[PDB]
Amino acid sequence: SNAERLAAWTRLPWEGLRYSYNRERRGTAARSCPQLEADVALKAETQPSEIPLERQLILEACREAERFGFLHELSIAIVEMERLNKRPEAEVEEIAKLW
């Protein structure tokens, strides 16, 4: 779905990316950031690999946004942050095709 694509497109660090997720989850029963962080940290250590924990965290956050219906709002917010980091418009175009 667009959750895996968005998680695939973003370059934001989790420390920054966590803010939009926390911001866009208002009004939903979605997991908080510490709940996500605790859940993902355990899931990472139950199947250890070379996959960075940051990638698993970001993918879990995008999936949770999709389950509880604020993935579109989260995609807009992530693109906003990337544009603040001067992410090239050519790369923003790749994710803009979801819209």
Side-chain angles (χ1 to χ4, degrees):
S1 71
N2 288 351
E4 282 79 10
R5 190 88 76 98
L6 176 59
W9 177 89
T10 187
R11 304 296 118 94
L12 295 175
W14 174 245
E15 185 183 357
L17 188 145
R18 64 181 174 159
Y19 299 141
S20 299
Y21 171 83
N22 189 70
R23 170 67 173 81
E24 303 305 328
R25 75 181 179 95
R26 296 187 183 168
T28 70
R31 278 172 293 170
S32 66
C33 293
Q35 293 178 333
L36 279 185
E37 287 167 1
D39 288 353
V40 178
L42 176 80
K43 84 136 175 170
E45 267 59 78
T46 59
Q47 285 174 349
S49 67
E50 300 193 14
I51 299 301
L53 183 68
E54 199 162 25
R55 294 268 89 213
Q56 308 181 46
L57 278 173
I58 292 177
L59 172 60
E60 189 75 23
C62 293
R63 290 182 169 186
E64 188 89 344
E66 184 186 353
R67 167 57 155 285
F68 291 96
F70 58 96
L71 180 63
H72 179 72
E73 292 84 346
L74 177 59
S75 65
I76 297 166
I78 287 178
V79 166
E80 277 183 335
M81 294 180 55
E82 297 257 4
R83 279 173 161 169
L84 266 172
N85 305 342
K86 301 182 179 166
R87 185 80 179 264
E89 285 296 305
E91 301 173 11
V92 177
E93 202 174 8
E94 173 72 15
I95 202 63
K97 72 182 55 181
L98 306 184
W99 304 331

